[PDB]
Amino acid sequence: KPASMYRDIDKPAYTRREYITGIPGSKIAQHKMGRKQKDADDYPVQISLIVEETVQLRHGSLEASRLSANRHLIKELGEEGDYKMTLRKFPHQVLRENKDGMRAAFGKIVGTAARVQAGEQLFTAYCNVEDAEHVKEAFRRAYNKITPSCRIKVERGEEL
Amino acid sequence: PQPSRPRKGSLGFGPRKRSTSETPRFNSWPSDDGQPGVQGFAGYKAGMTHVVLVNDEPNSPREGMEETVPVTVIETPPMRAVALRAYEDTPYGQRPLTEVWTDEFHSELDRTLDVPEDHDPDAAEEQIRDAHEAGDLGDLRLITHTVPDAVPSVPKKKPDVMETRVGGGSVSDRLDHALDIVEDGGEHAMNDIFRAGEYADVAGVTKGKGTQGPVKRWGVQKRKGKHARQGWRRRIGNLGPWNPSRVRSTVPQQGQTGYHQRTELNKRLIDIGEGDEPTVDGGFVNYGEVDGPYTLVKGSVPGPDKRLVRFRPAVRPNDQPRLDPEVRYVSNESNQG
Amino acid sequence: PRVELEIPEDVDAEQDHLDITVEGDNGSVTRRLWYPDIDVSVDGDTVVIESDEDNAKTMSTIGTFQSHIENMFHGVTEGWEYGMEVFYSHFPMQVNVEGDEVVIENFLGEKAPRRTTIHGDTDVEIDGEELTVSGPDIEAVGQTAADIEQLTRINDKDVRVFQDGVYITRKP
Amino acid sequence: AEFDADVIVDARDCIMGRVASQVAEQALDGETVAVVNAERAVITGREEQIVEKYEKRVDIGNDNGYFYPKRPDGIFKRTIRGMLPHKKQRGREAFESVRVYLGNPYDEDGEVLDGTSLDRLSNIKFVTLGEISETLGANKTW
Amino acid sequence: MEALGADVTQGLEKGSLITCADNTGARELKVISVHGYSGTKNRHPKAGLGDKITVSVTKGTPEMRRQVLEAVVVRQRKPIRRPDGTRVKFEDNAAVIVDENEDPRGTELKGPIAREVAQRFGSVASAATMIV
RNA sequence: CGCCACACGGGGUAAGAGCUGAACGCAUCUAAGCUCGAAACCCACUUGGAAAAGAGACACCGCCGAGGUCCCGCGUACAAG
RNA sequence: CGAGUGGCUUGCUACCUCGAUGUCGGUUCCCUCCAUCCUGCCCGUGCAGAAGCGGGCAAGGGUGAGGUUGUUCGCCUAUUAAAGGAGGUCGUGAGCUGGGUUUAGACCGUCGUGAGACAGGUCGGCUGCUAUCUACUGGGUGUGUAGGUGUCUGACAAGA
RNA sequence: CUGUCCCAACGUUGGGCCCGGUGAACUGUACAUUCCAGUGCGGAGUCUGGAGACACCCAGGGGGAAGCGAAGACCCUAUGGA
RNA sequence: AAGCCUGUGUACCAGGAGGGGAACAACCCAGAGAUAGGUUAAGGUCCCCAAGUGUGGAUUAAGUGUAAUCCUCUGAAGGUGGUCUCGAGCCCUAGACAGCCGGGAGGUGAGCUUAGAAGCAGCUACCCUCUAAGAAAAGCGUAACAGCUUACCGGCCGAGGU
Ligand SMILES: C=C[C@]1(C)C[C@@H](OC(=O)CSCCN(CC)CC)[C@]2(C)[C@H](C)CC[C@]3(CCC(=O)[C@H]32)[C@@H](C)[C@@H]1O
Ligand SMILES: [Cl-]
Ligand SMILES: [Cl-]
Ligand SMILES: [Cl-]
Ligand SMILES: [Cl-]
Ligand SMILES: [Cl-]
Ligand SMILES: [Cl-]
Ligand SMILES: [Cl-]
Ligand SMILES: [Mg+2]
Ligand SMILES: [Mg+2]
Ligand SMILES: [Mg+2]
Ligand SMILES: [Mg+2]
Ligand SMILES: [Mg+2]
Ligand SMILES: [Mg+2]
Ligand SMILES: [Mg+2]
Ligand SMILES: [Mg+2]
Ligand SMILES: [Mg+2]
Ligand SMILES: [Mg+2]
Ligand SMILES: [Mg+2]
Ligand SMILES: [Mg+2]
Ligand SMILES: [Mg+2]
Ligand SMILES: [Mg+2]
Ligand SMILES: [Mg+2]
Ligand SMILES: [Mg+2]
Ligand SMILES: [Mg+2]
Ligand SMILES: [Mg+2]
Ligand SMILES: [Mg+2]
Ligand code: NA
Ligand code: NA
Ligand code: NA
Ligand code: NA
Ligand code: NA
Ligand code: NA
Ligand code: NA
Numbered sequence A: 001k002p003a004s005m006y007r008d009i010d011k012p013a014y015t016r017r018e019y020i021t022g023i024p025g026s027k028i029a030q031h032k033m034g035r036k037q038k039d040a041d042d043y044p045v046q047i048s049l050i051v052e053e054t055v056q057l058r059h060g061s062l063e064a065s066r067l068s069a070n071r072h073l074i075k076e077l078g079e080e081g082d083y084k085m086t087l088r089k090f091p092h093q094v095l096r097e098n099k100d101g102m103r104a105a106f107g108k109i110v111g112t113a114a115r116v117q118a119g120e121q122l123f124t125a126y127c128n129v130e131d132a133e134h135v136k137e138a139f140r141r142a143y144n145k146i147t148p149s150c151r152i153k154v155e156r157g158e159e160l
Numbered sequence B: 001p002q003p004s005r006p007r008k009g010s011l012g013f014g015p016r017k018r019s020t021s022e023t024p025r026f027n028s029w030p031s032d033d034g035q036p037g038v039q040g041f042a043g044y045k046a047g048m049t050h051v052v053l054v055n056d057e058p059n060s061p062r063e064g065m066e067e068t069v070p071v072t073v074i075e076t077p078p079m080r081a082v083a084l085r086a087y088e089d090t091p092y093g094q095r096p097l098t099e100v101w102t103d104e105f106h107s108e109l110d111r112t113l114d115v116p117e118d119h120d121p122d123a124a125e126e127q128i129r130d131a132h133e134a135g136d137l138g139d140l141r142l143i144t145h146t147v148p149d150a151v152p153s154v155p156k157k158k159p160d161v162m163e164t165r166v167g168g169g170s171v172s173d174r175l176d177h178a179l180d181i182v183e184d185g186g187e188h189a190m191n192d193i194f195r196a197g198e199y200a201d202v203a204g205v206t207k208g209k210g211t212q213g214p215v216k217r218w219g220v221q222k223r224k225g226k227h228a229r230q231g232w233r234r235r236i237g238n239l240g241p242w243n244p245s246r247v248r249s250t251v252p253q254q255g256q257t258g259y260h261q262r263t264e265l266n267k268r269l270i271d272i273g274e275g276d277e278p279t280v281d282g283g284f285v286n287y288g289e290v291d292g293p294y295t296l297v298k299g300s301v302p303g304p305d306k307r308l309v310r311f312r313p314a315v316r317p318n319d320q321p322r323l324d325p326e327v328r329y330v331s332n333e334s335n336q337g
Numbered sequence C: 001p002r003v004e005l006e007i008p009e010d011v012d013a014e015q016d017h018l019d020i021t022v023e024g025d026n027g028s029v030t031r032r033l034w035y036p037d038i039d040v041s042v043d044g045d046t047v048v049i050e051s052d053e054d055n056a057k058t059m060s061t062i063g064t065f066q067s068h069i070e071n072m073f074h075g076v077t078e079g080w081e082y083g084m085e086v087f088y089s090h091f092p093m094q095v096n097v098e099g100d101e102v103v104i105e106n107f108l109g110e111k112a113p114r115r116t117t118i119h120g121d122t123d124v125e126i127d128g129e130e131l132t133v134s135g136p137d138i139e140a141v142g143q144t145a146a147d148i149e150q151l152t153r154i155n156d157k158d159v160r161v162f163q164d165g166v167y168i169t170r171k172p
Numbered sequence D: 001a002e003f004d005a006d007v008i009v010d011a012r013d014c015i016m017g018r019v020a021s022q023v024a025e026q027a028l029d030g031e032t033v034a035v036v037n038a039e040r041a042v043i044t045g046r047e048e049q050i051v052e053k054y055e056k057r058v059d060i061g062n063d064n065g066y067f068y069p070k071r072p073d074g075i076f077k078r079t080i081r082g083m084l085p086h087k088k089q090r091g092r093e094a095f096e097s098v099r100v101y102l103g104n105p106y107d108e109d110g111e112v113l114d115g116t117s118l119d120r121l122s123n124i125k126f127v128t129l130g131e132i133s134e135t136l137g138a139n140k141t142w
Numbered sequence E: 001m002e003a004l005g006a007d008v009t010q011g012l013e014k015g016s017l018i019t020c021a022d023n024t025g026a027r028e029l030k031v032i033s034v035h036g037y038s039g040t041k042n043r044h045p046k047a048g049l050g051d052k053i054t055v056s057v058t059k060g061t062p063e064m065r066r067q068v069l070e071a072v073v074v075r076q077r078k079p080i081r082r083p084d085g086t087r088v089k090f091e092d093n094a095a096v097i098v099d100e101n102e103d104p105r106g107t108e109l110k111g112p113i114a115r116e117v118a119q120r121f122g123s124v125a126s127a128a129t130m131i132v
Numbered sequence F: 001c002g003c004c005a006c007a008c009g010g011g012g013u014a015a016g017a018g019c020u021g022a023a024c025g026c027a028u029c030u031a032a033g034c035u036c037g038a039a040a041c042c043c044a045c046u047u048g049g050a051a052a053a054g055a056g057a058c059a060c061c062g063c064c065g066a067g068g069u070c071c072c073g074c075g076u077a078c079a080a081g
Numbered sequence G: 001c002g003a004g005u006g007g008c009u010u011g012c013u014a015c016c017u018c019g020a021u022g023u024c025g026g027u028u029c030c031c032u033c034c035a036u037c038c039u040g041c042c043c044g045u046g047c048a049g050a051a052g053c054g055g056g057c058a059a060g061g062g063u064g065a066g067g068u069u070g071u072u073c074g075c076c077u078a079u080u081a082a083a084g085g086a087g088g089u090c091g092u093g094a095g096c097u098g099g100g101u102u103u104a105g106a107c108c109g110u111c112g113u114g115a116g117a118c119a120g121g122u123c124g125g126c127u128g129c130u131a132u133c134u135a136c137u138g139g140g141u142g143u144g145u146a147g148g149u150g151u152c153u154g155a156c157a158a159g160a
Numbered sequence H: 001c002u003g004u005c006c007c008a009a010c011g012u013u014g015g016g017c018c019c020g021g022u023g024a025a026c027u028g029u030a031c032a033u034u035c036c037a038g039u040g041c042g043g044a045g046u047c048u049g050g051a052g053a054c055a056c057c058c059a060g061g062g063g064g065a066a067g068c069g070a071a072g073a074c075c076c077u078a079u080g081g082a
Numbered sequence I: 001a002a003g004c005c006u007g008u009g010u011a012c013c014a015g016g017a018g019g020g021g022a023a024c025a026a027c028c029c030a031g032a033g034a035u036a037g038g039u040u041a042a043g044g045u046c047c048c049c050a051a052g053u054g055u056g057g058a059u060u061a062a063g064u065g066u067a068a069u070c071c072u073c074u075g076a077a078g079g080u081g082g083u084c085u086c087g088a089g090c091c092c093u094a095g096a097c098a099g100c101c102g103g104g105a106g107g108u109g110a111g112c113u114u115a116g117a118a119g120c121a122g123c124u125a126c127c128c129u130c131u132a133a134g135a136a137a138a139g140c141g142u143a144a145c146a147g148c149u150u151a152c153c154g155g156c157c158g159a160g161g162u
């Protein structure tokens, strides 16, 4: 289904699983990528993907933008490179779809989404100085699979 | 899914109304090539007969063999170029300036025109030469006229007058060529302008058919099958859709058929002669006995037997000239068999 | 901005409106140089291209006008030379100059001759297998040289097998 | 042939609409205006887009009609009509006392009203009305 | 195709039962299509003398029947026009079967042929009995 | 259902192939400039077209007579006109 | 996975019309759209040629005949350069047809105690009106331009 | 077997068109020479903007007046009828 | 999703003129006895149309735009050496950036692998002479050599460059 139906934030906070039943599980597999044994402070660089517009991105759009994003870091830095990527958001917002007529309008449960406010970091990678232009490219591919226009911000890195 | 089909009838010869002048009026004239001369002649249609020829085309495998070709007999008696007209180049097109007239007129030319008694050709000619010197002189045309009294089969004695262009040489030498024909009496035959075997353009007003329906007029389908017995036979399906809530002028409707001016292109002149060689036994149907100056035009020609037709050297020919064909046999058999 | 161009001893350039005519021992090249707020002038013996504005779009043309003048100077002194060599594989191609147009016959086995036209004054002269396009107006020469190569354009088949045609060998 | 004009205007290198607007204003004041050298008039902008707009107006029409002039003669005369209430009493009399001419049928040179003139040395993107007319389908009679 | 050297008035239609003027075992032939012809809305595809037509065998021998073979229109009832102005018409409407290279499927062809079919399909002519 | 006739060529483009050419010393088909390039666009050609209110031009004839209408005999015309 | 255009399908809504805006399919006749099936000119190629494949420009013209079925759709045959798709009250019944849907008659199957029912099948089963206005096709009579005849021009208009 | 069709043609009689006489009706809120768009209760000759448009009359075939004709038989509703 | 269904607060339409918005119940000004003079509001001043072709300044080259709100006026994700303004680090008359020329050397074809590999198949190393430079060779190229360049030095040039 087109994300045009769920991208906007207009429905109330519908997250309480003790009231909602038959919720489809997360399509996302890994929230912590790279070398999760090493710290984020052991890295000189911290480049994040900032969302410009206040959206509601689905678990499918999250998995897809995480996949081709991490798959560039596995391609360019190897299967065990010197990096650690992270997706700090989690899909809590349960979605509906009415599928009769308008009689009994409350739709059945179809999927999950994450409420992302403007200015927030969806993804945050921590890499080395030489591997930086590979991550600014892992994020150029990642923003094409989510709904908004994005900023790639360097939070640690005067090495240019 | 509603099979395609081209619209019924042409939308170029519009509107299909009655013609103003029964005498054809050209709107296009040939390009200037060599020798200065008149760009057109005129005659009266006589009828049809077949003629046997020798194939002139070098591209055809029939080159040299006998071939039967249909021919329209048109009597073309000598015309009189009674005047010369000049056009000044105005920002509004080509507007007329002045006319140079004669002294010797035809005994029965006062049946249509107000024949001049006191005219000044000299100073009018001066105005044309001053306009030529100025550089604003456009194209020079001659006021031609026919001699219907020369044709015994045509009841009309009242001359058909029409304008004809002169071109070929430089603007100076053709103005003078024109003036030279005029000062004599203007007598000119078909031999003067046309040579046999050449391609000409015959313009004529068609046969008058009165008011005819869509089927005949625009060649639309008659109602087919079951739809033919319900009370509708020669009437069309509809005058148009719901919206546009108006009937378009493009829809095949009833009206006046015939008496339209047509300019039939690339007509080959098969023979130009004099006497009684193309005449038919018992005379031509609804016309009469041909004896005198004529032309033999290949195929058909617009209009009925007795109507005035006009000639012009082909503005758009496809094949290269094959002058003077070997005309072996011309038929004389009666058209009443 | 302003750029002052020194005109050589063999060269003489005259101005009439926005038109520049450059005369010399090889010929006369007339050109029309026009663009917003740019004015070209002759300060006795120097060509001055000056405009009050310094924006990139204007700087693009001031630069283009300089190379249009500098190259007109070479046109009237030494001249422009483009060298061409006719190439054929199976068919005996004939390239003959007829009037104010260069003609190519029997190209790839065709009955119909392929004819272009010589732009302006330009001299196209053949020495057997070679051809040398020459003249003062680089605009006419470069185009007459191009017109010749382009006249043998084949889009219908593979150009890697069908390599027949005149090509440009020497670029000035 | 003969027109007793109060004001005679020269359209040479003058921005069409701006001239038309001052000619329209004056027609309503009770002046007999005569626009001269219409072929030598001008319209600012990309040639390719100005032509598309004018070519479309020639394609537009039905059985009722929509006659749009091609000749630079009438193109000026119709733009003036678009600035005058030509369907009212007053507006018809004012429009009919304004005629546009190709070249100059008079001896007296026409004046160039203030603000209407274009600077060719400062501009390159414009078109001549006659250049539009040759592209529309007219015959160069000027 | 190559000119016939005569103007024809198409005497056949699609679905038209014509004769098979040969020894192939085919007696009656039924026209299906006219090679190279494209019509108009509401028109039965017309066939004439000297046209390569697609045909199906109506009457004949068990092995030859129900076959879709190509043929050339040899004879027709509707008058055709020779250059000398004379019209020519035949007794019946007949055709001879042909192959890929336009050679007759048989050996001996029955009845007269037209001299115009000779120019085009010469391999049928150099097998013809009578030529008119 | 028979027979006759129904372009070629130009002009400007599109996609496109290119030339001179700078911003950007080079390069670059493009930003200024230019040469080419579609059955497509304008012209050509055919038909209408003084009611085009800027309501047109020329030649002649006549303003006490030019010319037309009626009338009469009929069609190359025609439902009345 | 994301971003959209369209208004041809379907669905949703119930704004419009219940003192009636006649159905489907077909037909006839006219204008149009381009998201191009062919034709024109082009780009790439896993472009030798040949026949293709994929893309660009482009709506001038063309895009046909038939077998089953009421069919739209679709399957099928043979021809063709190709046998493109869509809009115009799902164009068009004061034009046609009336095969299908959807009256009153009757049969079968299913359900029903029964009358009777069926978004199951089937046979039979009607098509009103003299055009006022407007619209366009053609035909006249007046007025304007301001005496007569003949010849033209060309703003524009149509075409494939 | 054939004009049902390909594909339409000519002809015949009564009309149809003009003249004498006779002489109705359906329909009519008003205005009304329209067209292209737009707007409006979302389907305008009449609103907005343009375009076009000299008046009257003859014949026509019926695109439009959501044409004329019938207080929808469908559908729902009524504390309706049979 | 809706010119959707259903609440709530409020103002308005219904039952509200007049002015503006092209037309348009509800958007803006405005609530309005008659008549009259005057100044304003919303909105607007090139013409149609009352009032500026007003002033100082910059941008835009697409007719973008000339469309407050809207079913109604669209335009998105992505892309942009179109162009304008601004800041930041670094290089530069000890001559930068580019371009053109010149040089691009020997020990030495590194060694191993291998019949062979000699800058450039693969493994590992990746070392020092001459000099103003010159890699155990970065990119192409060869069956391999060869050839062409690339790092790197010099010259020409001359101003900002990245
Ligand atoms: C009968 C009304 C008919 C003639 C046809 C009608 O169709 C129907 O109403 C469905 S039932 C049709 C058959 N009808 C008898 C004719 C059953 C009573 C149909 C098509 C619609 C669906 C309803 C509206 C409509 C007018 C507009 C229209 O399309 C018509 C009515 C007002 C029309 O009078
Ligand atoms: Cl029918
Ligand atoms: Cl029109
Ligand atoms: Cl008005
Ligand atoms: Cl400019
Ligand atoms: Cl077929
Ligand atoms: Cl109040
Ligand atoms: Cl515009
Ligand atoms: Mg006879
Ligand atoms: Mg006989
Ligand atoms: Mg090929
Ligand atoms: Mg059919
Ligand atoms: Mg009711
Ligand atoms: Mg209706
Ligand atoms: Mg396209
Ligand atoms: Mg079209
Ligand atoms: Mg419909
Ligand atoms: Mg209807
Ligand atoms: Mg009906
Ligand atoms: Mg049935
Ligand atoms: Mg039935
Ligand atoms: Mg009726
Ligand atoms: Mg009921
Ligand atoms: Mg009851
Ligand atoms: Mg109320
Ligand atoms: Mg004012
Ligand atoms: Mg816009
Ligand atoms: Na239900
Ligand atoms: Na009837
Ligand atoms: Na209808
Ligand atoms: Na403008
Ligand atoms: Na028009
Ligand atoms: Na061309
Ligand atoms: Na949409």
Ligand code: NA
Binding pocket: none
């Ligand atoms: Na819908």
Ligand code: NA
Binding pocket: none
């Ligand atoms: Na129908």
Ligand code: NA
Binding pocket: G059
């Ligand atoms: Na098309």
Ligand code: NA
Binding pocket: none
């Ligand atoms: Na079918």
Ligand code: NA
Binding pocket: G089
């Ligand atoms: Na309908």
Ligand code: NA
Binding pocket: G093
């Ligand atoms: Na129907």
Ligand code: NA
Binding pocket: G093, G127
């Ligand atoms: Na009916």
Ligand code: NA
Binding pocket: H003
């Ligand atoms: Na009959």
Ligand code: NA
Binding pocket: H062, H063
């Ligand atoms: Na009607």
Ligand code: NA
Binding pocket: I012
């Ligand atoms: Na109130």
Ligand code: NA
Binding pocket: none
């Ligand atoms: Na108002």
Ligand code: NA
Binding pocket: I063
């Ligand atoms: Na605009």
Ligand SMILES: [Sr+2]
Binding pocket: A010, A011
């Ligand atoms: Sr909501």
Ligand SMILES: [Sr+2]
Binding pocket: A143, A144, A145, A146, A147, A148, A149, G002, I077
């Ligand atoms: Sr996005």
Ligand SMILES: [Sr+2]
Binding pocket: B002
């Ligand atoms: Sr249809």
Ligand SMILES: [Sr+2]
Binding pocket: B024, B025, B026, B027, B163
């Ligand atoms: Sr004439």
